[PDB]
Coordinates of C-alpha atoms in Angstrom, one line a residue:
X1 CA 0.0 0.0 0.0
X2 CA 1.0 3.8 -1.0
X3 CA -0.1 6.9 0.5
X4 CA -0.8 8.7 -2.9
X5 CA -2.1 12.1 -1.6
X6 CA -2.4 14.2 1.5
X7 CA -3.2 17.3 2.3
X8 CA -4.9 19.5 5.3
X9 CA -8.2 18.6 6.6
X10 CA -9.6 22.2 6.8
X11 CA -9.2 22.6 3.1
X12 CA -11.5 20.1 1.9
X13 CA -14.1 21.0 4.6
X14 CA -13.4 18.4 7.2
X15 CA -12.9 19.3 10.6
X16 CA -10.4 18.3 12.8
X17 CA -10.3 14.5 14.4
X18 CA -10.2 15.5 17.9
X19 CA -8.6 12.2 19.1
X20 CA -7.0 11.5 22.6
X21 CA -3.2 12.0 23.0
X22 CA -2.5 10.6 26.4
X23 CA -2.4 6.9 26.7
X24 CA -5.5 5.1 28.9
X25 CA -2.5 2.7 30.0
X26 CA -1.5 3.3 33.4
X27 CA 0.8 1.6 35.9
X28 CA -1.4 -1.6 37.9
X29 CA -0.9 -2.2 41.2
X30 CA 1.1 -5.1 40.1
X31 CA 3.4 -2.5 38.6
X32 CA 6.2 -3.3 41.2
X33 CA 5.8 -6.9 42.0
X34 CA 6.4 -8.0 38.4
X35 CA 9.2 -7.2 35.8
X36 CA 8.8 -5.8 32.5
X37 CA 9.7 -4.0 29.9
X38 CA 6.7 -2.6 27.7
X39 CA 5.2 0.8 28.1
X40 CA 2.1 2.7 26.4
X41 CA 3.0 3.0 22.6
X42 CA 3.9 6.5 21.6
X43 CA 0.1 8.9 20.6
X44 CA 1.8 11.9 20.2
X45 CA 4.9 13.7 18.3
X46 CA 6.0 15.3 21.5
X47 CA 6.3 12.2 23.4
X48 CA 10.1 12.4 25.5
X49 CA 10.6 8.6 24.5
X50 CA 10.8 9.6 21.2
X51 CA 14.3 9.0 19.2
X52 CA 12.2 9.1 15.7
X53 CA 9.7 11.8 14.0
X54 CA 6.4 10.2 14.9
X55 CA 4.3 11.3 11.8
X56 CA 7.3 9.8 9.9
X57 CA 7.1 6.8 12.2
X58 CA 3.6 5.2 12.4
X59 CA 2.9 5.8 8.3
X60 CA 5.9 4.0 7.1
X61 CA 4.7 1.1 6.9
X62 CA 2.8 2.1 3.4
X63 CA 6.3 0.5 2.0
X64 CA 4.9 1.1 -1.5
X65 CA 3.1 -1.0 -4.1
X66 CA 4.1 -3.4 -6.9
X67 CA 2.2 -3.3 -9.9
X68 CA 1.7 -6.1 -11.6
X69 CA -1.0 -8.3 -13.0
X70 CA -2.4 -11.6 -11.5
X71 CA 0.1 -14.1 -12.9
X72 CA -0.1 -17.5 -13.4
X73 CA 0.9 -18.8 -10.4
X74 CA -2.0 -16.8 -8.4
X75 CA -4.5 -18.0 -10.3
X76 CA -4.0 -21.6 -9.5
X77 CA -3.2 -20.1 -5.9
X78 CA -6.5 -19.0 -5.9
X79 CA -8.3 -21.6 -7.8
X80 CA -6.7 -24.3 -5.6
X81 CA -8.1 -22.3 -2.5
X82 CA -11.3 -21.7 -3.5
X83 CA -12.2 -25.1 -4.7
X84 CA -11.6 -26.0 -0.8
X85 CA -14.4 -22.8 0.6
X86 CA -16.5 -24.8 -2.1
X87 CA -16.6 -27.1 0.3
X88 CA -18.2 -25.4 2.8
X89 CA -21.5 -24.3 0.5
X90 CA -20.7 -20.4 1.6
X91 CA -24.2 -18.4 0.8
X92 CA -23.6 -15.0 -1.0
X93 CA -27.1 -14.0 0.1
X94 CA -27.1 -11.0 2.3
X95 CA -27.3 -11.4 5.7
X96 CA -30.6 -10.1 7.6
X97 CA -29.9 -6.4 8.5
X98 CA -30.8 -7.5 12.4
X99 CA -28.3 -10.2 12.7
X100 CA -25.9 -8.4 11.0
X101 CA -26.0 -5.6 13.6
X102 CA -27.3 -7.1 16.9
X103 CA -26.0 -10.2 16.7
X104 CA -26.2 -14.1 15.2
X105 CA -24.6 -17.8 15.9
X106 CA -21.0 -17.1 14.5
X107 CA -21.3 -13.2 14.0
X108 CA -21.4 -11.2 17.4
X109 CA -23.3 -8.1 17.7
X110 CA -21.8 -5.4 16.1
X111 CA -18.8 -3.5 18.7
X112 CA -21.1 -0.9 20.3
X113 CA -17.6 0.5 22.0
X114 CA -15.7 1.4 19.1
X115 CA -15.9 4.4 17.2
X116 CA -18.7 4.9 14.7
X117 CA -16.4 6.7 12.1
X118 CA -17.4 9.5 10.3
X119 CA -19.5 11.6 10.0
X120 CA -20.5 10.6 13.2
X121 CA -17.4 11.2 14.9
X122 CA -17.4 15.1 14.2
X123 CA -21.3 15.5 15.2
X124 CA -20.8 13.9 18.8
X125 CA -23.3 10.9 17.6
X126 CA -22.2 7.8 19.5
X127 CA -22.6 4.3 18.5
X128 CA -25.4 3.9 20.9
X129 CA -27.1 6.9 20.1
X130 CA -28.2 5.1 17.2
X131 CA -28.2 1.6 18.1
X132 CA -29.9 -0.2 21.0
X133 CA -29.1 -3.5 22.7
X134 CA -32.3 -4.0 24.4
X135 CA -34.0 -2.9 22.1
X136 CA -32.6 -3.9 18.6
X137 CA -33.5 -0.5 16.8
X138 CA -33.1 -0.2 12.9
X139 CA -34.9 2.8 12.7
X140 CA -32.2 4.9 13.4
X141 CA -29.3 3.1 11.8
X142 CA -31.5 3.5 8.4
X143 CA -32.3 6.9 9.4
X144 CA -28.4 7.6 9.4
X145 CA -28.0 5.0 6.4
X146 CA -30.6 6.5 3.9
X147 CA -28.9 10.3 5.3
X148 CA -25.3 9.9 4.5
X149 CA -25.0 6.4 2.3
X150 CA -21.8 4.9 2.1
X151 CA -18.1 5.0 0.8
X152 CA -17.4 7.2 3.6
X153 CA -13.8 8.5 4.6
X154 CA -11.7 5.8 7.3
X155 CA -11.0 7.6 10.6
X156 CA -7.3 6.5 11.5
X157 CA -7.0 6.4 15.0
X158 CA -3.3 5.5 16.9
X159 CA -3.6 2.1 18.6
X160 CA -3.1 2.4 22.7
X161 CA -1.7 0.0 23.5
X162 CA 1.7 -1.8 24.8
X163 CA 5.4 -1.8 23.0
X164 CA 9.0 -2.9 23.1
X165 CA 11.1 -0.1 24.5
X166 CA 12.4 -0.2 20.8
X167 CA 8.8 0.5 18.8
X168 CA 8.5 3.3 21.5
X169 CA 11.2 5.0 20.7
X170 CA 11.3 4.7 17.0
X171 CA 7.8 5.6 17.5
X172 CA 6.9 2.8 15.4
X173 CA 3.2 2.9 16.8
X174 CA 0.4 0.7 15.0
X175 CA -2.6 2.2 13.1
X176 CA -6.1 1.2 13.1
X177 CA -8.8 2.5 10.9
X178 CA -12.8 3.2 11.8
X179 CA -14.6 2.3 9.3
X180 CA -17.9 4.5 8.9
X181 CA -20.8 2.8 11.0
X182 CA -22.5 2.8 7.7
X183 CA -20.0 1.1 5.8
X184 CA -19.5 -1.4 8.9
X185 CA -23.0 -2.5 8.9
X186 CA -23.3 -2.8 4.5
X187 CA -20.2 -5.0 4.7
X188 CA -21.8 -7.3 7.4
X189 CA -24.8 -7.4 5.6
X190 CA -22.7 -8.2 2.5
X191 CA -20.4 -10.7 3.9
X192 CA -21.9 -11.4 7.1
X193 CA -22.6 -15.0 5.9
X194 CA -19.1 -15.4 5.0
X195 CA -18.1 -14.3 8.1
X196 CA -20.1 -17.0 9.8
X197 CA -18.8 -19.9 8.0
X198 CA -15.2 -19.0 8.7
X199 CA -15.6 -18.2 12.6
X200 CA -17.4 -21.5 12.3
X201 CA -14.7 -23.7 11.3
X202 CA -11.2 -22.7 11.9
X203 CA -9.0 -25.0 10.7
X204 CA -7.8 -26.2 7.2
X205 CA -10.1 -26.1 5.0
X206 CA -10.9 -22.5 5.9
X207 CA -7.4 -22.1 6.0
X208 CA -8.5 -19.5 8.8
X209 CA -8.3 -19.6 12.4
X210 CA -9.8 -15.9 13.4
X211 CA -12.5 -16.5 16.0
X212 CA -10.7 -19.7 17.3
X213 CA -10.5 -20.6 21.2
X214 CA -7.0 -21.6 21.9
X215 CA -7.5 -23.8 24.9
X216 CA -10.0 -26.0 22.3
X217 CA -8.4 -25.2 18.6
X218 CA -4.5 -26.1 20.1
X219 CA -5.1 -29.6 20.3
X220 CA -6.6 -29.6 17.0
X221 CA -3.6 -27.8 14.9
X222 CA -0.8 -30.8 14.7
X223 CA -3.6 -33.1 13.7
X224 CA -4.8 -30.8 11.2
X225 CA -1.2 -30.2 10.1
X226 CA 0.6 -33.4 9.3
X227 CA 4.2 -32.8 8.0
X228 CA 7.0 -31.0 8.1
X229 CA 6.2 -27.5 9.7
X230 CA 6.2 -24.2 7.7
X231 CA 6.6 -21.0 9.6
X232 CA 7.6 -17.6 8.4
X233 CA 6.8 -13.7 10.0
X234 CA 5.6 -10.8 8.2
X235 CA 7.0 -7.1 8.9
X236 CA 4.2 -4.7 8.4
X237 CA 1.6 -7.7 6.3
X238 CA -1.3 -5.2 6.4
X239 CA 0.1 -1.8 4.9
X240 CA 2.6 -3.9 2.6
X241 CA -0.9 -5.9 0.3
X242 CA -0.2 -4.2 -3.4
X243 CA -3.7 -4.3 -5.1
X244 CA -2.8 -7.0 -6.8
X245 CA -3.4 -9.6 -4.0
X246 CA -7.0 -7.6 -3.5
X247 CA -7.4 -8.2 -7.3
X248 CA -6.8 -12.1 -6.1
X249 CA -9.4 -11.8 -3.4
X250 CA -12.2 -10.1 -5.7
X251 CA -11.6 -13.0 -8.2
X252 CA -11.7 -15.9 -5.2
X253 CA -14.8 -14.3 -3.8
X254 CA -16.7 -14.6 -7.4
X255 CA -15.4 -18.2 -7.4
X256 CA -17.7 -17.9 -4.4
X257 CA -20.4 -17.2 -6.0
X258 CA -20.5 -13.0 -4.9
X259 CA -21.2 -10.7 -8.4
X260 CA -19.0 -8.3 -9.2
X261 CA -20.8 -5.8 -7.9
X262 CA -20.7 -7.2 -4.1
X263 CA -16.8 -7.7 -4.2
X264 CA -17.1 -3.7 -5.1
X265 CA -16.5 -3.6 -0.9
X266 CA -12.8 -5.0 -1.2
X267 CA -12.5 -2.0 -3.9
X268 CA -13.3 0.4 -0.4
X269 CA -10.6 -1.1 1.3
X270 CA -7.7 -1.5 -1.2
X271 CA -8.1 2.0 -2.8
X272 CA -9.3 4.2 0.9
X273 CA -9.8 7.8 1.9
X274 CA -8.8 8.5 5.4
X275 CA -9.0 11.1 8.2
X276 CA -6.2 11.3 11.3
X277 CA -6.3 14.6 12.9
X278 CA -6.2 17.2 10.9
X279 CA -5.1 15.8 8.3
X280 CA -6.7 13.7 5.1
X281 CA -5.3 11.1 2.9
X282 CA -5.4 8.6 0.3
X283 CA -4.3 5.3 0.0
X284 CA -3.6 2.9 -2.8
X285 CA -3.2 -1.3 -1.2
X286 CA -3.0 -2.0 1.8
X287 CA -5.5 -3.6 3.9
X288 CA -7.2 -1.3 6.3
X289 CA -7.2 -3.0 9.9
X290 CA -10.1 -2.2 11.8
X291 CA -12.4 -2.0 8.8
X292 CA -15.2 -4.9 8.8
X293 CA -13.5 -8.2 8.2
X294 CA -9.9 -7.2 8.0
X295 CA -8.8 -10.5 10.0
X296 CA -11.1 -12.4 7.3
X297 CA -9.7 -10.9 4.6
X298 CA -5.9 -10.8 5.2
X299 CA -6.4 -14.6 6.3
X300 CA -7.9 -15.3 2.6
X301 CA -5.0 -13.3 1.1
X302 CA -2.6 -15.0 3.3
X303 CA -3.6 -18.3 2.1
X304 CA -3.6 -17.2 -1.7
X305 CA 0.3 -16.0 -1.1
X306 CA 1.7 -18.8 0.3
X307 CA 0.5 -21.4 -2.1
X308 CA 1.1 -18.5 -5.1
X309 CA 4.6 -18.6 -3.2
X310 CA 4.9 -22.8 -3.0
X311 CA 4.1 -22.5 -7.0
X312 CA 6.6 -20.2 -8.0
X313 CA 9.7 -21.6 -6.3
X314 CA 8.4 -24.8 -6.4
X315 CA 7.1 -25.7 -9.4
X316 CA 5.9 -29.5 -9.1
X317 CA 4.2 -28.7 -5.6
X318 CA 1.0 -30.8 -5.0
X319 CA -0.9 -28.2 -2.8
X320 CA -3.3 -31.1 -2.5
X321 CA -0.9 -32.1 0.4
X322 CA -0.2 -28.7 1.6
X323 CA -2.2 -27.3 4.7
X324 CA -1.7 -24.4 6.7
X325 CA -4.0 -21.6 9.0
X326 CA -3.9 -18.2 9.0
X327 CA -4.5 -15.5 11.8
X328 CA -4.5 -12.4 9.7
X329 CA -0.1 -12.0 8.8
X330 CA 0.5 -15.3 11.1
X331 CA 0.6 -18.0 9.7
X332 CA 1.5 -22.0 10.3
X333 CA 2.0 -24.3 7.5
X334 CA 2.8 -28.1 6.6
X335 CA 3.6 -29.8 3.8
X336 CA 5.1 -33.3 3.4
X337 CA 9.0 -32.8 2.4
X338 CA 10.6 -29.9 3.7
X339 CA 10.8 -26.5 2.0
X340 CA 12.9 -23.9 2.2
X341 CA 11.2 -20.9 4.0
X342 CA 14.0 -18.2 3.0
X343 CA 12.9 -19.3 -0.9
X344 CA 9.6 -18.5 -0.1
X345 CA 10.5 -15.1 1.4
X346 CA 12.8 -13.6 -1.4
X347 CA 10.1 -14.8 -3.8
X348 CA 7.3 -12.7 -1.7
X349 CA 9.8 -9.9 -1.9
X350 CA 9.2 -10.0 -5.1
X351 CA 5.6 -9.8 -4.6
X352 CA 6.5 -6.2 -2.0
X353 CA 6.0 -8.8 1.0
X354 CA 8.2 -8.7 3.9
X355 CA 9.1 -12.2 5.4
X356 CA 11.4 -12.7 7.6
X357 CA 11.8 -16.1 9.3
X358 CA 9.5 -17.0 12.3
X359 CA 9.7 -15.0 16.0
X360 CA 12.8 -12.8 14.4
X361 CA 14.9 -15.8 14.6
X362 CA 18.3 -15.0 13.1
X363 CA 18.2 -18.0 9.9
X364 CA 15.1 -19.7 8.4
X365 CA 16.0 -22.4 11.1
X366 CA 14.3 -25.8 11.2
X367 CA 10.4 -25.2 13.0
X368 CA 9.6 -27.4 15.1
X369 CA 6.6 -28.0 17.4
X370 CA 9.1 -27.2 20.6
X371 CA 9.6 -23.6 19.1
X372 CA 6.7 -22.8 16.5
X373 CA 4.5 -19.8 17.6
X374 CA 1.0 -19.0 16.7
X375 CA -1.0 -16.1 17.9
X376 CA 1.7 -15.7 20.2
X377 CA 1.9 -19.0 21.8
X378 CA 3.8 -22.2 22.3
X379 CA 2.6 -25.6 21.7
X380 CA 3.1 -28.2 24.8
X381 CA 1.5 -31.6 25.0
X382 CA -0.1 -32.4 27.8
X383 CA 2.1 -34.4 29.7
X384 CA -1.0 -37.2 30.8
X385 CA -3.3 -36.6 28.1
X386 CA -0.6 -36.6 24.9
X387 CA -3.6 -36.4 22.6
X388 CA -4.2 -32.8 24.2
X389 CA -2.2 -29.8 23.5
X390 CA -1.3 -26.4 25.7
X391 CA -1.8 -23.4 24.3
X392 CA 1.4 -21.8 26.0
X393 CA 1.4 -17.8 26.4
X394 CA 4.9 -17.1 27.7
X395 CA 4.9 -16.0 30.8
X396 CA 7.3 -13.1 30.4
X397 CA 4.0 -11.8 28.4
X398 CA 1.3 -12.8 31.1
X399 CA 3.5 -9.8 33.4
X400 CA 4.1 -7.3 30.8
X401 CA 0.5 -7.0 30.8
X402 CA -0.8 -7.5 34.5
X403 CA 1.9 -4.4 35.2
X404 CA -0.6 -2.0 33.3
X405 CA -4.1 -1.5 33.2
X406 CA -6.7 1.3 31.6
X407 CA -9.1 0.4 34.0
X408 CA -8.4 -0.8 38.0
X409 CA -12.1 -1.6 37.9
X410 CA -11.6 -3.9 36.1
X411 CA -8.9 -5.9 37.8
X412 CA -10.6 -8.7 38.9
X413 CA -11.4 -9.4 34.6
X414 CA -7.7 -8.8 33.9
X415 CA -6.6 -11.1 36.2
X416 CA -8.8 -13.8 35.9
X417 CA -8.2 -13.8 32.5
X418 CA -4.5 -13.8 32.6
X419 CA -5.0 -16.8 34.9
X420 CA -6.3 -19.0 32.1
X421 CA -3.5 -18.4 29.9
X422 CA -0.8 -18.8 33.0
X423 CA -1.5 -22.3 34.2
X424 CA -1.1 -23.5 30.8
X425 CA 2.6 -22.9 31.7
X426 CA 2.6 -25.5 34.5
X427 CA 1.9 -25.7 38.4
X428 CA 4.6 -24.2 39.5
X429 CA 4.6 -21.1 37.4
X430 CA 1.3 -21.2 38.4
X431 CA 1.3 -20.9 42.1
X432 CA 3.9 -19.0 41.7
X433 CA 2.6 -16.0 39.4
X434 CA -0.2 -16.4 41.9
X435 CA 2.1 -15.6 45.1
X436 CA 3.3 -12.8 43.8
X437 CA -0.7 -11.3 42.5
X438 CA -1.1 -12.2 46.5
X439 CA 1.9 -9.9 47.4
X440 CA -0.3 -7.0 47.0
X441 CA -3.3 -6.5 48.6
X442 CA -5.6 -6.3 46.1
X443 CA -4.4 -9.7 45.1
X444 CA -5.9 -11.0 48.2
X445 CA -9.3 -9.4 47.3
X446 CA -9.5 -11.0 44.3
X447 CA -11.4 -14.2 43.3
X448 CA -9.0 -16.3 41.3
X449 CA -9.4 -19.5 40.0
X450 CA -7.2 -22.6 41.4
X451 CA -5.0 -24.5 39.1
X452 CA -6.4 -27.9 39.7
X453 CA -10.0 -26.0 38.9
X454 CA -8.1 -24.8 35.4
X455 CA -7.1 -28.2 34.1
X456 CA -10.0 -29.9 35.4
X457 CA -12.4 -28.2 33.0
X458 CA -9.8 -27.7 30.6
X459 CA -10.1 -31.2 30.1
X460 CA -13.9 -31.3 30.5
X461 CA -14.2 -29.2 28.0
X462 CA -13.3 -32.1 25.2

């Protein structure tokens, strides 16, 4: 993606995005008791941490686009993956405007937190001013539909969120985009059944693991994923799609069965109009994070580049034997004989993709299933039930984050939570991560589950 034009806000008659520029991240409790290293991701050009220009910073990761057209090795790429969604008898038909918005079996209710994008943004309308849980209004949202239509500018907001001491001071801070309320709820209705299917079965055939429970999907993934292992990072995935790879996903979605005129959406995200600050852009690629279905979308992509990949260095590949899942940029891959992952990566350079080789190990190393990542974590048998695999956060993460908090009201969620991805680590981290939550007083006022509790309906739960 390219930013191909930008200019000041107040000279095309949009006002000002007044967005926050002081992080909600403050220092837990827990702050003391635990080490780390993170701290709140740079939201302003003044910051003191800074050792970089900001603006420079958090938009250079529109690397630029490669123009070509949809070669030969795509298109069986994308043939190849599409004749495995066949399988799964996706409807194209619109989903119904009230289970689109409010809520349906493998499509929650539309994120009444997040912003509602523009125009709303810059007329103090809420999310909630138009929409209703309880209630399950329409009127409103097709008040505000019919009024102001769609193919409405992106609001870029600065993610808040927690960093390496090195993306704070190169103020390498992430980006995510708010789509228009109006365009969020037309995409859902558009693609809303798509979206079903895929949060529905993560896995291989999907090729898609957004919406997956790691303490349930884990113990699925090495069954799933036979042969040698496949692994390699992205740097900057989203920013770094040329068109061409959205050109791949329009033609895999009419494979589907959508008209060109429905894949007209993935036109809005590829080609975008954006507002951050005061400030208003255009962008050529890239996928938008944030938008409706980005995770979706980069997953399908994701699986088109690898096999397009496979094909090009490879020629002679049976993809038949390939499998792999995506999360968005991550992905984990097998195929029967090995393969060289730093092939792969110069030939997606080609392509303006960034791989590097997995968890910014030094060499393309051999993955294995003692040091392959996904979604962050570690895979570890179960040491009884060998059949059953850990999902293993490291614990180095589980106390970068308890250190912080945007909400002490919340404590009791936080911790709880980080709970279930602790014990996964073993008893003894266990008990110990919970002696030192118990240090503090709060800890002792806090409800917290006991390990024995954990793996007992860990394993219930198969």
């Amino acid at each position: 993606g390219e930013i191909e034009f930008i200019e000041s806000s107040k000279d095309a008659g949009f006002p000002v995005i007044n967005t926050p520029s002081k992080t909600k991240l403050e220092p837990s409790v827990f702050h003391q008791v635990f080490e780390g290293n993170k701290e709140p991701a740079v939201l302003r050009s003044g910051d003191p941490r800074l050792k970089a220009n900001f603006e420079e910073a958090i938009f250079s990761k529109y690397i630029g686009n490669v123009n070509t057209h949809v070669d030969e090795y795509m298109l069986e790429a994308v043939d190849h993956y599409a004749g495995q969604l066949a399988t799964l008898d996706i409807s194209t038909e619109p989903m119904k405007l009230e289970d689109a918005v409010y809520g349906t079996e493998g499509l929650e209710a539309l994120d009444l937190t997040t912003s509602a994008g523009y125009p709303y943004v810059a007329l103090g309308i809420k999310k909630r001013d138009i929409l209703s849980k309880k209630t399950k209004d329409l009127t409103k949202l097709k008040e505000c539909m019919d009024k102001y239509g769609l193919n409405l500018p992106m609001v870029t907001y600065v993610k808040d969120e927690l960093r390496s001491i090195e993306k704070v001071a190169k103020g390498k801070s992430r980006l995510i985009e708010a789509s228009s309320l109006n365009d969020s709820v037309a995409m859902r209705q558009t693609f809303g059944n798509l979206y079903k299917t895929f949060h529905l079965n993560p896995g291989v055939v999907t090729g898609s693991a957004v919406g997956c429970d790691p303490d349930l999907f884990w113990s699925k993934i090495p069954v799933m994923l036979d042969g040698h292992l496949i692994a390699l990072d992205y740097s900057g995935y989203d920013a770094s799609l040329s068109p061409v790879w959205f050109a791949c996903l329009k033609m895999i979605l009419e494979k589907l069965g959508y008209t060109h005129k429905e894949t007209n959406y993935i036109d809005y995200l590829c080609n975008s109009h954006h507002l951050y600050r005061d400030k208003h852009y255009f962008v050529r690629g890239g996928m938008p994070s944030g938008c409706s279905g980005t995770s979706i979308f980069n997953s399908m992509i994701n699986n088109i580049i690898i096999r397009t990949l496979m094909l090009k260095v490879y020629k002679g590949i049976d993809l038949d034997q390939f499998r792999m899942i995506a999360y968005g940029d991550d992905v984990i891959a097998s195929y029967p004989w090995p393969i060289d992952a730093s092939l792969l990566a110069e030939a997606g350079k080609g392509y303006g993709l960034i791989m590097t080789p997995a968890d910014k190990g030094e060499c393309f190393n051999e993955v294995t299933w003692t040091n392959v990542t996904f979604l962050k974590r570690y895979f570890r048998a179960d040491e009884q039930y060998p059949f059953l695999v850990h999902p293993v956060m490291p614990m180095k993460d589980i106390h970068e984050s308890i250190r912080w908090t945007k909400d002490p009201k919340n404590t009791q969620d936080h911790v709880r939570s980080l709970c279930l991805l602790a014990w996964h680590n073993g008893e003894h981290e266990y008990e110990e991560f919970i002696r030192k939550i118990r240090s503090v007083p709060v800890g002792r006022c806090l409800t917290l589950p006991a390990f024995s509790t954990l793996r007992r309906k860990w394993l219930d739960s198969f």
